[PDB]
Design an enzyme around this catalytic site. Structure first.
Site, PDB file in Angstrom:
ATOM      1  N   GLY A  75       0.783  -1.223   0.000  1.00 17.53           N
ATOM      2  CA  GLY A  75       0.000   0.000   0.000  1.00 17.53           C
ATOM      3  C   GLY A  75       0.818   1.279   0.000  1.00 17.53           C
ATOM      4  O   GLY A  75       2.031   1.250  -0.225  1.00 17.53           O
ATOM      5  N   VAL A  77       4.765   0.776   1.411  1.00 16.32           N
ATOM      6  CA  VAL A  77       5.042  -0.521   2.027  1.00 16.32           C
ATOM      7  C   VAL A  77       5.118  -1.639   0.988  1.00 16.32           C
ATOM      8  O   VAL A  77       4.409  -1.618  -0.012  1.00 16.32           O
ATOM      9  CB  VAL A  77       3.959  -0.874   3.056  1.00 16.32           C
ATOM     10  CG1 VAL A  77       4.416  -2.025   3.937  1.00 16.32           C
ATOM     11  CG2 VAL A  77       3.626   0.339   3.902  1.00 16.32           C
ATOM     12  N   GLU A 124       7.719  -7.266  10.866  1.00 12.87           N
ATOM     13  CA  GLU A 124       7.042  -8.553  10.730  1.00 12.87           C
ATOM     14  C   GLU A 124       5.812  -8.328   9.861  1.00 12.87           C
ATOM     15  O   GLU A 124       5.174  -7.267   9.913  1.00 12.87           O
ATOM     16  CB  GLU A 124       6.611  -9.117  12.086  1.00 12.87           C
ATOM     17  CG  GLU A 124       5.577  -8.275  12.798  1.00 12.87           C
ATOM     18  CD  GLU A 124       4.951  -8.991  13.995  1.00 12.87           C
ATOM     19  OE1 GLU A 124       4.439 -10.117  13.819  1.00 12.87           O
ATOM     20  OE2 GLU A 124       4.970  -8.435  15.115  1.00 12.87           O
ATOM     21  N   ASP A 162      -0.598   8.918  14.559  1.00 12.71           N
ATOM     22  CA  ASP A 162      -1.234   8.608  13.279  1.00 12.71           C
ATOM     23  C   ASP A 162      -2.241   7.455  13.144  1.00 12.71           C
ATOM     24  O   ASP A 162      -2.338   6.895  12.062  1.00 12.71           O
ATOM     25  CB  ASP A 162      -0.264   8.674  12.094  1.00 12.71           C
ATOM     26  CG  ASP A 162      -0.987   8.990  10.786  1.00 12.71           C
ATOM     27  OD1 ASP A 162      -2.099   9.575  10.840  1.00 12.71           O
ATOM     28  OD2 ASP A 162      -0.461   8.652   9.707  1.00 12.71           O
ATOM     29  N   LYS A 171      -4.996   4.643  12.461  1.00  8.64           N
ATOM     30  CA  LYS A 171      -6.072   4.494  11.480  1.00  8.64           C
ATOM     31  C   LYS A 171      -6.168   3.036  11.089  1.00  8.64           C
ATOM     32  O   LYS A 171      -5.232   2.269  11.322  1.00  8.64           O
ATOM     33  CB  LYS A 171      -5.836   5.343  10.230  1.00  8.64           C
ATOM     34  CG  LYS A 171      -4.579   4.996   9.461  1.00  8.64           C
ATOM     35  CD  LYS A 171      -4.161   6.163   8.579  1.00  8.64           C
ATOM     36  CE  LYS A 171      -2.665   6.369   8.634  1.00  8.64           C
ATOM     37  NZ  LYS A 171      -2.282   7.470   7.736  1.00  8.64           N
TER      38      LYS A 171
HETATM   39  O1  LIG Z   1      -4.158  -7.225   2.295  1.00  9.53           O
HETATM   40  C1  LIG Z   1      -3.129  -6.907   3.143  1.00  9.53           C
HETATM   41  C2  LIG Z   1      -1.991  -7.684   3.163  1.00  9.53           C
HETATM   42  C3  LIG Z   1      -0.923  -7.360   4.034  1.00  9.53           C
HETATM   43  C4  LIG Z   1      -1.011  -6.240   4.880  1.00  9.53           C
HETATM   44  N1  LIG Z   1       0.096  -5.906   5.775  1.00  9.53           N
HETATM   45  C5  LIG Z   1       0.435  -4.530   6.117  1.00  9.53           C
HETATM   46  C6  LIG Z   1       1.584  -4.282   7.146  1.00  9.53           C
HETATM   47  C7  LIG Z   1       2.312  -5.371   7.667  1.00  9.53           C
HETATM   48  O2  LIG Z   1       1.997  -6.657   7.272  1.00  9.53           O
HETATM   49  C8  LIG Z   1       3.340  -5.170   8.590  1.00  9.53           C
HETATM   50  C9  LIG Z   1       3.669  -3.849   9.000  1.00  9.53           C
HETATM   51  C10 LIG Z   1       2.934  -2.723   8.476  1.00  9.53           C
HETATM   52  C11 LIG Z   1       3.263  -1.372   8.897  1.00  9.53           C
HETATM   53  C12 LIG Z   1       2.559  -0.283   8.392  1.00  9.53           C
HETATM   54  C13 LIG Z   1       1.512  -0.482   7.468  1.00  9.53           C
HETATM   55  C14 LIG Z   1       1.189  -1.803   7.051  1.00  9.53           C
HETATM   56  C15 LIG Z   1       1.911  -2.923   7.563  1.00  9.53           C
HETATM   57  C16 LIG Z   1      -2.144  -5.457   4.855  1.00  9.53           C
HETATM   58  C17 LIG Z   1      -3.217  -5.787   3.981  1.00  9.53           C
END
Ligand SMILES: Oc1ccc(/N=C/c2c(O)ccc3ccccc23)cc1
EC number: 2.7.11.22
Length: 293
Positions: free
Chosen positions: A10, A17, A76, A122, A124
């Site tokens: 995203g 990410v 992770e 932040d 959400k």
């Molecule tokens: O369909 C999806 C598949 C994997 C996702 N992981 C997001 C995520 C993470 O697995 C680990 C640390 C993070 C830190 C900030 C924002 C997102 C993440 C979310 C939706």
């Protein structure tokens, strides 16, 4: 280059990410790339401190990589975020016991971070991550303090104001732990009703949506409010809404907890620790969600 981008997870708070596999260990991780003068070294030290944050309800920060003069955070990986889960559950809604379990865990995560003097700032649905075993975890803690606060994301994407506490909207220079409780309150309401509580499309619209619901604050409910940097005596005066109208059909324990998380005065707003002792959680359990991965 020692990772294989499996996908773009995203577009995040301070950057994009990715889901990556480490060819070395074969381990699957989330890889966040941060925005360039060659970077500040202040941020690097503070963020490095976060690696030491270990709690079941906090997404583990595995590594901070400064190299080729850019910054990557290695987290992770979890398979789903609360935003996607809410959208997927929008027909039927999330069962109350699961909403309750999720809120309980999130408050545990916050209580832990706050006791270590770490703020999120932040929160959400996008940064709350879930797994198949019923856990929910907060991600991107302390990034906001390390860096500064942008009016954009990375490049051309619209930042979400929906979860922003009113003291921030009113131009308060000093955040407290209360801003995270406010955000969590908004998310709780959103899980229950299946629509965002305060979906503002601008800063003033965000403020006025809060005002139209909770009433325009005054010196009675919020001592000092009329002195806030962005406060205008010309703000329209709205009467507070009957609160049973805000999150139907949540019961009175839940409504009572929510009202305490949504107090205008950051000083009256409930703490994560105190919230954990609220009667709303007397019957808390840990159900497993139905997750489509
Ligand atoms: O369909 C999806 C598949 C994997 C996702 N992981 C997001 C995520 C993470 O697995 C680990 C640390 C993070 C830190 C900030 C924002 C997102 C993440 C979310 C939706």
């Amino acid at each position: 280059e020692n990772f294989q981008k499996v996908e773009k997870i995203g577009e995040g708070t301070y950057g994009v990410v990715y889901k990556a596999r480490n060819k070395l260990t074969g381990e699957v991780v989330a890889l966040k790339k941060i925005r360039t003068e060659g970077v500040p070294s202040t941020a690097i030290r503070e963020i490095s401190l976060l690696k030491e944050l270990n709690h079941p309800n906090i997404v583990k920060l595995l590594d901070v990589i400064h190299t080729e003069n850019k910054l990557y955070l290695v987290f992770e990986f979890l398979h789903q975020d609360l935003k996607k889960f809410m959208d997927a559950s929008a027909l039927t809604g999330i069962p109350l016991p699961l909403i309750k379990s999720y809120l309980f865990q999130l408050l545990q995560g916050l209580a832990f971070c706050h006791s270590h003097r770490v703020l999120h700032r932040d929160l959400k649905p996008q940064n709350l991550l879930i797994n198949t075993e019923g856990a929910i975890k907060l991600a991107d803690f302390g990034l906001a303090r390390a860096f500064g606060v942008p009016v954009r994301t990375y490049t051309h994407e619209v930042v979400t104001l929906w979860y922003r506490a009113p003291e921030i909207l009113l131009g308060c220079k000093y955040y407290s732990t209360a801003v995270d409780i406010w955000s969590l309150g908004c998310i709780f309401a959103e899980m229950v009703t299946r629509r965002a509580l305060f979906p503002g499309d601008s800063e003033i619209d965000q403020l006025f949506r809060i005002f139209r619901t909770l009433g325009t604050p005054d010196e009675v409910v919020w001592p000092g409010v009329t002195s806030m940097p962005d406060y205008k005596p010309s703000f329209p005066k709205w009467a507070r809404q009957d609160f049973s109208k805000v999150v139907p059909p949540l019961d009175e324990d839940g409504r009572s907890l929510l009202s305490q998380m949504l107090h205008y005065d950051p000083n009256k707003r409930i703490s994560a620790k105190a919230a954990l002792a609220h009667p709303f959680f007397q019957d808390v359990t840990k159900p497993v969600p139905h997750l489509r991965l």
